[PDB]
Amino acid sequence: ATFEIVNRCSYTVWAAASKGDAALDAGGRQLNSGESWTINVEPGTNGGKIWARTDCYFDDSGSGICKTGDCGGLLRCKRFGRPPTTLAEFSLNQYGKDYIDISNIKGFNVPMDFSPTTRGCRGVRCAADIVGQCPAKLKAPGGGCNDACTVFQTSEYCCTTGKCGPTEYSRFFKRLCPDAFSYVLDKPTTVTCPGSSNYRVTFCPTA
After folding, report:
1. CB 3.0–4.6 Å: which of 27, 117, 170, 206 could bond 76 by disulfide?
2. Which CATH architecture has domain 1-207?
3. Burial letters for 86-117: b for 16+ Cβ neighbours within 10 Å, e otherwise?
């Protein structure tokens, strides 16, 4: 499956793509404002994620640091990134279908649209200005908006026991971005696509 990753932000981002225990494709790359990076993701990829990282410095060997989304200080990510990170999430060829969604469960750093480029389903979008409206206690001093689990580490926010409900914090994400997951047991906003669809992830999809 091809994913075209497009940076429409006015700032540089460093895209990242991982399934948690491995990179997808090169796993990471700098995208200046306007650039596009097409990756190939193996069919059957389960629990893949794509995200953006901001204000990064990498040296010549591709080690450094990112203010949001850092995945162990590597340009080429092999694991998931440090919150806050808006997440494009997908599982491909799962009993004949693809599954896609956007999640705010690990916070928000950059707006995003995640859409198929082939026929038979709709995309999802989380493009509101969540960083600017972020509640005080969720603001990440390093940039972005943390989820409440990251900030407070309680069973209710982390949904440790499997029984949580919506909270004042998760309702903030859901009000700004109704089509993204706002907490673990949120009513699914996952989109079912034909197996083997292709996709575009766009950072900052709107002016």
Report:
1. 27
2. Sandwich (2.60)
3. bbbbbbbbeeeebbbbbbbbbbbbbbbbbbbe
